[PDB]
Amino acid sequence: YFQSESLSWMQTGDTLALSGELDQDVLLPLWEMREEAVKGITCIDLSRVSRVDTGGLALLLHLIDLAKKQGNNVTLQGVNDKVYTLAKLYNLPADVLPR
Amino acid sequence: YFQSESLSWMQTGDTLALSGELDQDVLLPLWEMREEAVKGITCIDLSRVSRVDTGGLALLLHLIDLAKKQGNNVTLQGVNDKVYTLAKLYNLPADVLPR
Amino acid sequence: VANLVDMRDVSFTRGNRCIFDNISLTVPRGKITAIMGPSGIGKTTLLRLIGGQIAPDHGEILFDGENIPAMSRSRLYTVRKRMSMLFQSGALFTDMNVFDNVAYPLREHTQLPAPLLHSTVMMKLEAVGLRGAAKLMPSELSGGMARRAALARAIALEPDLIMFDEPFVGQDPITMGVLVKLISELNSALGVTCVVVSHDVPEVLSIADHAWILADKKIVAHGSAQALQANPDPRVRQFLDGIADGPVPFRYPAGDYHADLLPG
Amino acid sequence: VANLVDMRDVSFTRGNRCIFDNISLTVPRGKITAIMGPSGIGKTTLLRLIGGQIAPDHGEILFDGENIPAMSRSRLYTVRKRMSMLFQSGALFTDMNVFDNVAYPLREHTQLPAPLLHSTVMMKLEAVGLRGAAKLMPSELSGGMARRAALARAIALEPDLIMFDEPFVGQDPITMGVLVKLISELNSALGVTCVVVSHDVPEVLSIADHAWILADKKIVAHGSAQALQANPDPRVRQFLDGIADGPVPFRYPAGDYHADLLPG
Ligand SMILES: Nc1ncnc2c1ncn2[C@@H]1O[C@H](COP(=O)(O)OP(=O)(O)O)[C@@H](O)[C@H]1O
Ligand SMILES: Nc1ncnc2c1ncn2[C@@H]1O[C@H](COP(=O)(O)OP(=O)(O)O)[C@@H](O)[C@H]1O
Ligand SMILES: [Mg+2]
Ligand SMILES: [Mg+2]
Ligand SMILES: [Mg+2]
């Protein structure tokens, strides 16, 4: 009956936690605040995301890269199985996306 | 070096013996004398034929049928293996060609 | 819904001859469905019925629960945007390069930001292995390479249903093997629903989750690949195995052979 | 002669690009020879070289020991009568029935008597299983049924060499299985020499006595069917088995992926 989508993000110390659906219709608020949301961070937690489309994964890669440009290596924690299937389809190397 | 073709036929009592090549270029003299060469006969001897093309086999079927119309059943003796392969290709029944 | 497309007792007639006698067919969403049958049965017709370009005489064609023939012209126009009939005409703009082709749909019909759109096309070009050909033109593209770029642009908007009309014809086994793995890869990853019409029976059954065989204006047999290739039925076995003679006779009915050879 | 067609160091060039780099190929008479390779290599070109419609830049094409490019126009015209390139245009007269089509060659170019000519066409119509369609027209003929009537008229004059240019494309496995058995039957019975170009690798190797694989303007590998399908060579194995990736890369050379995703 109800199929609403949202995307939220909370930074706790050095870890950024995304939760909700990470897809095309809701990712704009995060991209506009991309540089402010990831630059205190050294680990992105997709632990609490339920859906990831191709555009949302592209946003994730840019978020990972923005933290790499700061100079601190970043961890990927809690990634869903389907996201890795999508990454394997796009042959995403270890640079853009840690496994 | 020499590749000449001929077709001969000799009737000995009740058996007609064909010898030579039974093909398109040499079969006309026999077809023009078809009714005279097969009507004392009740067995056709392809024992001594070396080559049989599709037209020559058609001549053989008409020779077999002309003897059938007389009222005496006819034998087929000495048929080469390749002739039967040709008959199997054309699905020739037991009526037109005894085996 | 469990079935993205659901045909219910569908009959279609052209001129004097009937093509379909109330057929009922199912395409479960998220899975690959294969349509097979002799040439001239109406496979392309059956696809255009799902698309809405032609309407059946009787029956209903429910896409995502919605009946296509009864749709408004405004609604059918929008519902068709969730579909993609691949290897049609149009496919690729001939005046822009490969990257611009695959990017063109998102550049207009989505309001995704620009740097993410750019990364999205790069990924989808890697999916069909044409990332190095991003600056090439369709003029220079190979035979198979062109069709892979069409597939890339098709999945650019990520439609719900993709239909392939004999996509393997005239293709060498390398070109064909690539497109078979590609279709199976995009189905198991993006979850796109695929309908594949083909005569290449062994290749299509290797990736299909459900198959259908048509003959004599009706559905002969359906089922899974393992269920079909183990189905002992002469008219099903003759088609799946490609045997010269069976319930489809090799020989046209002729009558008495002896009379045709020896008349008067 | 042992080889009806014998190509010796044959090179052919169109415009700026070279198609053949002194190829040397063999067609033994009485046996079925198969030509395979990716689309655009020059398979149709190689056939027209044997036929004489085009001449090579260098080399010699010996049909029955006689070099075709050096033949007189009077001699090439007569030598071509021993050949038949099948499933061309012309094939069937559209204004006369099936029997009259297959009978037309013998009715003029042979001086066989009439009742034997009539029986001969009936037999050859039974060979392709169309004796019941003798009074039908090409208008009414099915897809596969039409091509079987063309095959019947082709073997009506019993030529020495028959060439098939991708004869199986767009065909269901029943239609294809019929034409495969037909070709193999006419070869083992009439001894006609057959050259078959095709992409349907498993079907053509089942009846071929010798096969050839072409890639990069040259012959990759030849040999018998059992010798080829047991040949462990990556570029031979990738083609015969239809593997997506191999010596023919699935991925176009692209460079650094990370930079294409994340620029500035
Ligand atoms: N405009 C038309 N008028 C009459 N008959 C048609 C028309 N269009 C198609 N047909 C017939 O209906 C059938 C439709 O076949 P098609 O949809 O092309 O199936 P397939 O692609 O499997 O051959 C064909 O046999 C064709 O002869
Ligand atoms: N008139 C022409 N001018 C320039 N190039 C040509 C011409 N005709 C053919 N070619 C090229 O030469 C090759 C010949 O291929 P073809 O004989 O059709 O082989 P196949 O039938 O195996 O594709 C093709 O790649 C084509 O691009
Ligand atoms: Mg079709
Ligand atoms: Mg060709
Ligand atoms: Mg095949």
Author numbering:
A (entry chain B), B (entry chain B): -1 to 97
C (entry chain A), D (entry chain A): 5 to 268
Question: What does the study report here?
Answer:
An ABC transporter is a critical component of the Mla pathway, which is a phospholipid transport system that is important for outer membrane (OM) integrity in many Gram-negative species, and has been implicated in the Maintenance of outer membrane Lipid Asymmetry. Two copies of MlaF, an ABC ATPase, and two copies of MlaE, a multipass transmembrane protein, form an MlaF2E2 subcomplex that represents the conserved ABC transporter core. MlaB is stably associated with the cytoplasmic part of the transporter complex: one MlaB subunit binds to the side of each of the two MlaF ATPase domains. We and others have hypothesized that MlaB may regulate the MlaFEDB transporter complex, perhaps through its interaction with the MlaF ATPase. Here we report structures of the MlaFB complex, and present a model for how these two proteins may work together.
Here, we focus on the MlaF2B2 complex, which is fully assembled as expected for an ABC transporter ATPase subunit. The final model for MlaF2B2 consists of MlaF residues 5–267 (of 269 total) and MlaB residues 2–97 (of 97 total), as well as an ordered portion of the N-terminal purification tag [Prior to publication, coordinates are available for download from our website: URL]. At the core of the MlaF2B2 complex is an MlaF homodimer, assembled in a ‘head-to-tail’ arrangement similar to the NBDs of other ABC transporters in the dimeric state. Two ADP molecules are bound at the dimer interface, along with two Mg ions, representing the post-powerstroke state following ATP hydrolysis and phosphate release. Our MlaF structure adopts an open conformation capable of nucleotide exchange, with 13.9 Å separating the P-loop/Walker A motif in one subunit from the ABC signature motif in the opposing subunit (between Cα of Gly46 and Gly147). The MlaB subunits bind near the periphery of the MlaF dimer and make no direct contacts with each other. Intriguingly, each MlaF subunit possesses a unique ~25 aa C-terminal extension (CTE) that wraps around the neighboring MlaF subunit, forming a domain swapped reciprocal ‘handshake’, and interacting with the adjacent MlaB as well. Much of the C-terminal segment adopts an extended ‘random coil’ structure, before terminating in a short helix that binds to the neighboring MlaFB module, where it inserts three hydrophobic residues into a groove at the MlaF-MlaB interface (Tyr261, Leu265, Leu266). The MlaB binding site on MlaF is centered on the helical subdomain of the core NBD in MlaF, distant from the MlaF2 dimer interface and the ATP binding sites (with ~30 Å separating the nearest atoms in MlaB and the bound ADP). Binding to MlaF is mediated entirely by the helical face of MlaB, including helices α1, α2, and α3 and the C-terminal coil. α2 lies between α1 and α3, and consequently is at the center of the interface and makes the most interactions with MlaF.
